[PDB]
Symmetry: D2
């Protein structure tokens, strides 16, 4: 019989209608009476309730680290791991854990719900039951995100709908599944001063200059189409000056789906000549958490630029 | 028989194998008799000199197109704007605010592949924009692409590349194709458009709100939630207390901010409901370019001016 | 306290383990079925259970009669049934329950209710919930999180959770005078598909006694060969009081009727096979004349067809 | 490169049909004379065929027109009415054994000349694909999709989205087989269907019966019906079980004890044409029943 560790970090799933309030042991009490969670074909599971519970819109890198450390501490003791989490930043946590759990060789499924588990026809019951069932019986040895009958690669996920049952999508990768080597290495991630900004017509040098002031170590630029920005020295000079002082400037597309394609370096692509590197088809969550992972280590800006473009954990498609 | 004005502003649609040759688009269409079908309207092409690569568009370029439509407004039955795909949704959004009391169709379109090339979407998009402007008039700024007519100020880039370039995530497409006009001077405006993320520091957000910034679009989580840390909320409140307009949009592909005791509201942040980034960025340009006070701008940003937002 | 729903367990995998009282025992220990937002329900298990692949029109009448018996004793009705012919039963009941003023929801599943991750658990729970809290006073069919109009449903995927569709009508939703229950008896009807070069000989065989009606599945908006060999057989059948109804062979759309009309064939508009087959049973069982039946087949009696 | 265009009939080359009006309309549409477009030659059938009046001799007429022109060209396009296009495509897939040049069938809702007509798009792409991206099978082109011919069925009764391939994703020397009309019953089982009515369906001259039964191929377990299917099979009638469902496969057993064989996931058009193909050749009932169950031309899946 398989055994799954369930980290209840926070989220509506384990709360009680009142609006929703946290109640200690509420999830343990409800699952004891729900016979499907004790079927012979279901794994054994153990709940660790975080004290205190985290509202996911308040999540910080320190919380990513706590979750990683909890998995690491329990790694040898279970067949797989389910993280319950609030929906607002679930994709950030999934993305960050993909980088932090190096040589992961058991399943980690992050999930949660729109509605508390105990409510009639809540997605909480289906999401938790499928996360347990899949980690035990159809293991994918990566950090996945389970929502609305789909298992996504965690570092490919973004919020689809601001709320409701179809909360998540993986715009640039097929779902891993429809529910119809080396030792685990965890390094310590810390908060990093990153700007995430969107280019728009006429964006000023003065504005951009200010986005790049200390303490900023990296900038994610969301640019047009396959990664184009204004051909204006006013913008390109501030981006080049930044990279010349060691800022990592990463190009993502504004588009819902698709890839930055800055072409060969020999094409003299204007952003590329200003020191900007391609983020290919990464999500904002994957690029933001990847920069946290790399800036948290002792790597040079050139080492980070190289690793930002390499597919480390299945987060990006390069050609 | 209807008459349509075509502003060829820029984009691949009018280019040849890809470089700009002046007069090329007009010469190519005269060879293509479907454009001269009895059920098609007459049209006149004004080729911009110089042509604009849409990744280089500025608000001055919005002004140029608005002024062109204004100059030609009484002389035609409708208007087609040919434009590069990269910022087409910015221009459609800006023209929706700029063309006040518009009462003729304005359809913006373009293509991946030049008109002349075999099986180009260029030929289909221009034929349908002309046809719809004359025969199926919606007297607003619309965007036509991939056999769909979108509300301009509801449009955003769907795929970075390819035929399925645009979507209106928060409004149904208008159409599957299977007072007098007022125009004020819009100018560039120092606006920050930033995304919140876990642990985002007060010092980074303080940088985004330095002078000369007049407004900040925040892309926040879910139905509009941000971290409850005084480090962030104190900086947003400092900015609103000195007249900066701080607008909350969701980082979600679809859906609406719902700010309702709300922490961001207490810090002076206003809801952008379900607006696109392109609608909110162009709407702040539209309002900041006028003489309006910060309080006026906060109220008008929340009002549905042109069909750009749903507030129920 | 709460609404009360009558659950007729007529047959189907949903209730199996073929063990009497099993469904009642299973549901007693499933707490979600006793939620405060759930209605009370009463289960009646048919003795014997019906395999839906052997359903006859007498089984249709048994279900209609059971609803009649219980009509004034409950707020709504859920019919559990085998998937193979669920759409025929839903179609037949829509005709037989004239002036229905309470919800009837037919459902079942691919997997027994008791199995982990079964659709039987989801289907029964939503049928109960919908019958009580979102009543539609018609015969509806619930499957794969969709409530369809019963006489609009047809089989979609041979198996799998997505086994029904309503190709000519939107879903009812996404989770006059009193009731007259009609009698339906078995009727000799042919249901056949036209193809290139189909001989007058083969169509004659379809129209032999004791056939009273023929459903033709024809091309696009209802086209048949302009060949006297075929139209002669059809006009001959119609002249001796056989009702010939034209359906399209397409997955969706309507017959738009003209040569077949001249051979006495009438339009089935956008009806499903299930609707047209059960509607002919309904009308033939009333001893109406061929002309009365041809008219009523073309009228929208229960929401089964769109006419312009 | 050079494509042969058999203009058999259909709304596409019409105005009502007008002798020669297609060829003269095309002369005035320069995209068809683009340098990246192959050369092509139109054969206007005399007389044109309303695809609803199509017969298997018309399938022969088309197969032979192809065979004759086979060496003269790089590929073939059949312009055809929409009503029975999938039947024609399925039939040619079986007849055109060892095919090594593209055959694409197409047509339209709207005559080629009309503004925003799908006729224009369909002919241009059928010519383009046959030259520039050859697939050596009988294919059907509609609503910007290239289907395997013997996997296609009528989707909507009209409209631009009229065809689907529900059980398959979009896409020796040539031996051309004969085909003739064959007496085949295509019937739908329903609750309580009488043994009398089924007995009548199976009377001479019927050589074969396609059943559209429930789900994965279930029929009533009543002797009335099984006896008549078994009696017809015992005297050499080929009874093929197809699902009534829009998609999916028969998986067979009561019907198999009565001699009925599985049509797997075939379309009605493929089973009905495969029976025409097999019955038109020198085969016993047992040989036909075996070949019906083997994937001959990409028409069926069996695990």
């Amino acid at each position: 019989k398989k055994s799954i560790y369930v980290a209840y970090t926070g989220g509506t799933i384990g709360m009680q209608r009142s609006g929703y309030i946290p109640v200690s042991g509420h999830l343990q009490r409800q699952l004891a009476l729900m016979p499907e969670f004790h079927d012979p074909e279901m794994p054994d599971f153990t709940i660790h309730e975080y004290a205190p519970l985290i509202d996911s819109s308040d999540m910080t890198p320190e919380d990513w680290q706590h979750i990683a450390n909890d998995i690491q501490q329990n790694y040898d003791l279970y067949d797989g791991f389910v993280i319950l989490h609030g929906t607002d930043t679930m994709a950030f946590t999934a993305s960050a854990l993909s980088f932090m759990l190096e040589n992961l060789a058991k399943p980690v499924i992050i999930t949660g719900s729109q509605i508390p588990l105990a409510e009639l026809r809540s997605d909480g019951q289906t999401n938790l039951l499928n996360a347990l069932y899949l980690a035990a019986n159809h293991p994918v040895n990566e950090v996945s995100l389970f929502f609305n009958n789909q298992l996504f690669r965690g570092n490919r996920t973004t919020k689809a709908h601001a709320d409701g049952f179809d909360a998540f999508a993986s715009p640039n990768l097929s779902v891993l599944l429809e529910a119809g080597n080396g030792p685990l290495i965890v390094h310590r991630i810390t908060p990093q001063p990153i700007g995430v900004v969107t280019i728009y017509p006429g964006i000023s040098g003065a504005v951009v200059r200010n986005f790049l002031l200390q303490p900023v170590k990296a900038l994610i630029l969301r640019s047009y189409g396959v990664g184009n920005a204004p051909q204006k020295a006013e913008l390109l000079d501030e981006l080049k000056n930044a990279s010349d002082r060691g800022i990592v400037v990463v190009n993502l597309t504004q588009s819902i789906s698709g890839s930055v394609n800055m072409g060969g370096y020999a094409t003299g692509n204007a952003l590329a000549q200003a020191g900007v590197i391609s983020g290919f088809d990464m999500t904002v969550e994957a690029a933001l958490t990847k920069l946290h992972y790399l800036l948290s280590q002792s790597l040079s800006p050139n080492e980070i630029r190289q690793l930002m473009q390499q597919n480390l954990r299945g987060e990006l498609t390069d050609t």
